[PDB]
Design a binder for these strands. Structure first.
Ligand SMILES: COC(=O)c1c(OC)cc2cc3c(c(O)c2c1C)C(=O)[C@]1(OC)C(=O)C=C(OC)[C@@H](O)[C@]1(O)C3=O
Ligand SMILES: [Mg+2]
Ligand SMILES: [Mg+2]
Ligand SMILES: [Mg+2]
Ligand SMILES: [Mg+2]
Ligand SMILES: [Mg+2]
Ligand SMILES: [Mg+2]
Ligand SMILES: [Mg+2]
Ligand SMILES: [Mg+2]
Ligand SMILES: [Mg+2]
Ligand SMILES: [Mg+2]
Ligand SMILES: [Mg+2]
Ligand SMILES: [Mg+2]
Ligand SMILES: [Mg+2]
Ligand SMILES: [Mg+2]
Ligand SMILES: [Mg+2]
Ligand SMILES: [Mg+2]
Ligand SMILES: [Mg+2]
Ligand SMILES: [Mg+2]
Ligand SMILES: [Mg+2]
Ligand SMILES: [Mg+2]
Ligand SMILES: [Mg+2]
Ligand SMILES: [Mg+2]
Ligand SMILES: [Mg+2]
Ligand SMILES: [Mg+2]
Ligand SMILES: [Mg+2]
Ligand SMILES: [Mg+2]
Ligand SMILES: [Mg+2]
Ligand SMILES: [Mg+2]
Ligand SMILES: [Mg+2]
Ligand SMILES: [Mg+2]
Ligand SMILES: [Mg+2]
Ligand SMILES: [Mg+2]
Ligand SMILES: [Mg+2]
Ligand SMILES: [Mg+2]
Ligand SMILES: [Mg+2]
Ligand SMILES: [Mg+2]
Ligand SMILES: [Mg+2]
Ligand SMILES: [Mg+2]
Ligand SMILES: [Mg+2]
Ligand SMILES: [Mg+2]
Ligand SMILES: [Mg+2]
Ligand SMILES: [Mg+2]
Ligand SMILES: [Mg+2]
Ligand SMILES: [Mg+2]
Ligand SMILES: [Mg+2]
Ligand SMILES: [Mg+2]
Ligand SMILES: [Mg+2]
Ligand SMILES: [Mg+2]
Ligand SMILES: [Mg+2]
Ligand SMILES: [Mg+2]
Ligand SMILES: [Mg+2]
Ligand SMILES: [Mg+2]
Ligand SMILES: [Mg+2]
Ligand SMILES: [Mg+2]
Ligand SMILES: [Mg+2]
Lengths: 397, 62, 131
RNA sequence: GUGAACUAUGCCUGGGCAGGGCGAAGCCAGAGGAAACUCUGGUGGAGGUCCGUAGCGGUCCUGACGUGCAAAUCGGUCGUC
RNA sequence: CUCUGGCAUGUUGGAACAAUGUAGGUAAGGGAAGUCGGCAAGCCGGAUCCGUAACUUCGGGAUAAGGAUUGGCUCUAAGG
RNA sequence: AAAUGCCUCGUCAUCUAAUUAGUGACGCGCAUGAAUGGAUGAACGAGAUUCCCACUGUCCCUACCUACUAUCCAGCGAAAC
RNA sequence: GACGUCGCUUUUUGAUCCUUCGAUGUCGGCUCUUCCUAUCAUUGUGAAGCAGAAUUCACCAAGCGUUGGAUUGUUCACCCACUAAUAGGGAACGUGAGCUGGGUUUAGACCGUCGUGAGACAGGUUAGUUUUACCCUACUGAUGAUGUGUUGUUGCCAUGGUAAUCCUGCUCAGUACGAGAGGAACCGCAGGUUCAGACAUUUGGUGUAUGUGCUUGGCUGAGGAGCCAAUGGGGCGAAGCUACCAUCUGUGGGAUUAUGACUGAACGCCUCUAAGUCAGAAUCCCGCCCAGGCGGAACGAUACGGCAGCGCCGCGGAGCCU
């Protein structure tokens, strides 16, 4: 009978087998819909979570209370060095779904890509794709390869580009690269195939994939928490202080007579390390990295045309548990799944942005680069040492 | 992007940090962190706390 | 125009705040918050700018044993104010109003939060300072 | 027929019970009254007196444990001392 | 807490530090709204100086209630 | 309308925003009542009940930390059913 | 909808005694899930003694929500208050190896009535031990198994789950409507509630980094440096974890239901219906999102410095088992 007081469902049943993710990267699982009227472009990218900071911008929202006033918003920094396209896969759609027809790889694949192909690079002979690049440099193999290209052109409906990240530009311990299939959209199959084989063996920047102040989706693996109980895992109400065999339980699991524990009651188990797909993450800024023209320059990072300083995106003491960003970055609005150093699939949206919350051009006033390793109170080393004057070690120096 | 000065320590409070304390007398105060906040509410003298700008300007450390 | 953003509440039902106008009340004992649909076991709570139903526990006898609408003007609990700054007050205070927002009193002792001063123009008129 | 080696109660002969609080009678002095006496300050150390050890007991957590350390125990909190 | 005396952690060790426990803490803002019920926990606490109500069998209540002070160091008086 | 009143959540007052609770009254009291003791008490109570102040994770609404477990291993190794 | 009359339901209480007395833990609350619809609100509609606003009666409809308290052990009840609304039920009158133990319902005791009494009371009162999971299944997570020669990378999607919800303010507009009093709606804009999934830049919490100051008692002859007091206490505190106590995000189609229609017979007229068309929703199905089959795919590499294996080209041969 009749639970006597209405309360909604604890947790969502659209998210469960609430188990560890089978992948570490983050599968797209749905690319944007193709229309051949658009130009040829990519639809996703692969970045790494560096850290968080906050910004100051001036809002242009007519009718809102914060119209033409300055707000502070948290941002997430994703380091995105350019991805190397090294392969291309084609798909044909069948009444059983959509199967891969033919892959073609490139000559001279890099060692971090082959590191992805091996489970123990130390004890291996590193023999992967050697007989393949043999048939690339050959001439009997060469006519075979263009025959495969022509067959792919006349039969495939969906082409995708296999691209890897280049981990030698990152502050991480991992030297093994991340590969990814990124769907190519906007054209005929012949057009996108010659476009992709033009881009073969080559670098693609996030400047070319994404743009300023558009809304994208972030796909990743939620931060891992381990084996948790029902109070942490499902946020059920804690039982009163005088409960004999434990407080952090669910007091009743189903009635007598469905005679089984249902799949919809709260149980203890794995929390976190979950594959999630969050949408409507607004890009605030695309960085530019550490270029060398002369005695080099890093203002092309967080110099915001209203401070004109010479600071990078990096805080004092660097990004905690990550390192420092020396590559192209992407600043997103808000929080994003995963730990620091976690690889994030970033992809184009598959809705249409007609919203005044969306379609909005932003303009940053300030980017906070105080130290996140404490309650840091200085933006730059020059500002800190000019505020403090000479120290004892500086004096003896 | 207005930068305020901490009421207890006299440091620069950048626009995302610290807290602001309005008293019943209409006077408001800005604190860089909870160290300065707790010293203020415990009514310590910033000219007696060694690491403050008021202390260093009184003792001519500049 | 413009609607109030969400602030941190921290002022539940059983709270006794102090009456901040010259009506002759000293205390306000919250019994309700105007606009709460609520949830199982969750206590209804208020923040600055909220109309509450309140009784006055000590004060004038012609005020004491009744229910009045009141508006919370100062909270001891810190709330973010969307220009980044977190703000909190020394006390918890509210004023007795009527159903359409007119103050029963005539003068407010102490600062009044901006999040209620923009919402209630008759309260902000009687205020001394808008903190 | 056998048991008071546990426990119940009487008797006989032994042993034991920090430190503090309140301050009964008795007593000394000073002051006020015609007396009767009264007031003040000390002293003194009574009580099935109070706080609280050892001891004796066993309130509550309806705590632990509950195929136990234990066929009734343990911890904190308690009653009396 | 330490000395004399005694011991080897109470019938085993090692490695990790999940849930649930058992025992112990802390917690913004509210302050019993929790619950049958303030259960449990918390508050208070020693001493010194003030100041103590109703009621009463005049003994008490009574540490009623309430308030202030308290460290270190250098002295000065008084008490044989 | 009591540790005694069915009707009964009796009626009035007070206490609260709201009280089958509490207290003060009322009394044709199912079925109160005078050593089957009646009515009162100061002091006392690990006795039952109500309210207020203070206080708090009892709650809003949970979180974090520590010890011993649980866990995994080496040795040892039961029982209920 | 009177007098009458036909039903349904098993959320009432009876009637019965079929099952259980070598035992099915007996009230209520708490917690948590799911179902129903006889729909309170919300979506889409039809009707009115529907001018507007409010309301009432029906239909498709159970997707989603249905609260915080005072008193009582209470289920019920009654009141305060908020709300879009505070709908009604079921699951062994769901749920005690989940709790609790206030009630009832052992032994102690008091009162009233009854009894000569021992004692009784479906009358009141007070105090009264709530045990076991390590088995199987279920469920929650965690390894693995089964073929593709081995092994890796990149992928597909069968099937299973599924999610968003409601409300204010501005404008419309003091306009339509209405004599007046009053008084809407669509588009749009700005936010909020409930829920979901995250996250830690900031604010807060934690804090044995046993980090760094202070400090009590003791101890190392003192200084200095330290230690002990089951974390000696206290102040501040990095990292990490963590809070509607901070911050971020939450979405598109198709067939259609009620209904309103088009053409149009039956019935030389009419008719949404018979044949044939249309619009149509918090429903349903799918997408998005989560998992990824004793289900598939594309591609890589495929075993010696020695006798040492493997693959392919042979009908190339001789035969064996099954
Ligand atoms: C009616 O509520 C019960 O169901 C109930 C109960 O609820 C907790 C507790 C008990 C407890 C007990 C008994 C019960 O019957 C009993 C009952 C019925 C006994 O009979 C007992 O033996 C076990 C005995 O024979 C001697 C005594 O009194 C003569 C009891 O104290 C006794 O020792 C005991 O512990
Ligand atoms: Mg219901
Ligand atoms: Mg218990
Ligand atoms: Mg930090
Ligand atoms: Mg509740
Ligand atoms: Mg004897
Ligand atoms: Mg005694
Ligand atoms: Mg004792
Ligand atoms: Mg004991
Ligand atoms: Mg027990
Ligand atoms: Mg005693
Ligand atoms: Mg030990
Ligand atoms: Mg040992
Ligand atoms: Mg031994
Ligand atoms: Mg607190
Ligand atoms: Mg506090
Ligand atoms: Mg209470
Ligand atoms: Mg209560
Ligand atoms: Mg309640
Ligand atoms: Mg207690
Ligand atoms: Mg008293
Ligand atoms: Mg002194
Ligand atoms: Mg009574
Ligand atoms: Mg009460
Ligand atoms: Mg009475
Ligand atoms: Mg007693
Ligand atoms: Mg039967
Ligand atoms: Mg028969
Ligand atoms: Mg039976
Ligand atoms: Mg049986
Ligand atoms: Mg049984
Ligand atoms: Mg059973
Ligand atoms: Mg229906
Ligand atoms: Mg649903
Ligand atoms: Mg039942
Ligand atoms: Mg059960
Ligand atoms: Mg049980
Ligand atoms: Mg009981
Ligand atoms: Mg018995
Ligand atoms: Mg007995
Ligand atoms: Mg009895
Ligand atoms: Mg008789
Ligand atoms: Mg009872
Ligand atoms: Mg007892
Ligand atoms: Mg085990
Ligand atoms: Mg499906
Ligand atoms: Mg410390
Ligand atoms: Mg010392
Ligand atoms: Mg020494
Ligand atoms: Mg020293
Ligand atoms: Mg020692
Ligand atoms: Mg702290
Ligand atoms: Mg939150
Ligand atoms: Mg039709
Ligand atoms: Mg249609
Ligand atoms: Mg449609």
């Amino acid at each position: 009978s009749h639970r006597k007081f209405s309360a909604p469902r604890h947790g969502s049943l659209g998210f469960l087998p609430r188990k560890r993710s089978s992948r570490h990267r983050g599968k797209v699982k749905s690319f944007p819909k193709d229309d051949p009227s658009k130009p040829v472009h990519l639809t996703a990218f692969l970045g790494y979570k560096a850290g968080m900071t906050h910004i100051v911008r001036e809002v242009d929202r007519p009718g809102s209370k914060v119209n033409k006033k300055e707000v502070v918003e948290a941002v997430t920094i994703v380091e995105t060095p350019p991805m190397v396209v090294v392969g291309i896969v084609g798909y044909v759609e069948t009444p059983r779904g959509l199967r891969t027809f033919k892959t073609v790889f490139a000559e001279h694949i890099s060692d971090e890509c082959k590191r992805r192909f091996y489970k123990n690079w130390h004890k291996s002979k590193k023999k992967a794709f050697t007989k393949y690049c043999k048939k690339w440099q050959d001439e009997d193999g060469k006519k075979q390869l263009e025959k495969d290209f022509s067959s792919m052109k006349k039969y495939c409906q969906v082409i995708r580009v296999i691209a890897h990240t280049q981990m030698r530009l990152l502050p991480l311990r991992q030297k093994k690269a991340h590969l990814m299939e990124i769907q190519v959209n906007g054209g005929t199959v012949a057009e996108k195939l010659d476009w992709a084989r033009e881009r073969l063996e080559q670098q693609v920047p996030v400047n070319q994939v994404f743009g300023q102040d558009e809304m994208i989706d972030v796909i990743g693996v939620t931060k891992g928490k381990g084996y948790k109980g029902v109070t942490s895992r499902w946020h059920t109400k804690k039982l009163p202080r005088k409960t004999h065999r434990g407080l952090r339980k669910v007091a009743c699991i189903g009635a007598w007579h469905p005679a089984r524990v249902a799949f919809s009651v709260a149980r203890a188990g794995q929390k976190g390390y979950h594959h999630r797909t969050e949408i409507n993450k607004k890009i605030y800024k695309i960085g530019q990295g550490y270029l060398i023209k002369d005695g080099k320059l890093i203002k092309n990072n967080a110099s915001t045309d209203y401070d004109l300083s010479d600071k990078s995106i990096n805080p004092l003491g660097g990004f905690v548990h990550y390192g420092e960003v020396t590559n192209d970055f992407v600043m997103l609005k808000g929080c994003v799944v995963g730990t620091k150093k976690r690889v994030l699939t970033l992809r184009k949206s598959l809705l249409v942005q007609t919203k005044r919350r969306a379609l909005e051009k932003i303009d940053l006033k300030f980017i906070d680069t105080t130290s996140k390793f404490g309650h840091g109170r200085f933006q730059t080393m020059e500002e800190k040492k000019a505020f403090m004057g000479p120290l004892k070690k500086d004096r003896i120096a | 992007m207005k930068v305020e000065l901490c009421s207890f320590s006299g440091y620069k409070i950048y626009p995302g940090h610290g807290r602001r304390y309005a008293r019943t007398d209409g006077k408001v105060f800005q604190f860089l962190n909870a160290k300065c906040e707790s010293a203020f509410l415990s009514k310590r003298n910033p000219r007696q706390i060694n690491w403050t700008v008021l202390y260093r300007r009184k003792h001519k450390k500049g | 125009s413009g609607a109030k953003f969400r602030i941190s509440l921290g002022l539940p039902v059983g709270a006794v705040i102090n009456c901040a106008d010259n009506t002759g009340a000293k205390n306000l004992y919250i019994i309700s918050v105007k606009g709460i649909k609520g949830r199982l076991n969750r206590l209804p709570a208020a923040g600055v700018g909220d109309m509450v139903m309140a009784t006055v526990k000590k004060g004038k006898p012609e005020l004491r044993k009744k229910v009045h609408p009141a508006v919370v003007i100062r909270q001891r609990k810190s709330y973010r104010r969307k220009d980044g700054v977190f703000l909190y007050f020394e006390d918890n205070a509210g004023v007795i109003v009527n159903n359409k927002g007119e103050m029963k009193g005539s003068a407010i002792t102490g600062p009044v939060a901006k999040e209620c001063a923009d919402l209630w123009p008759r309260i902000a008129s009687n205020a001394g300072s808008i903190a």
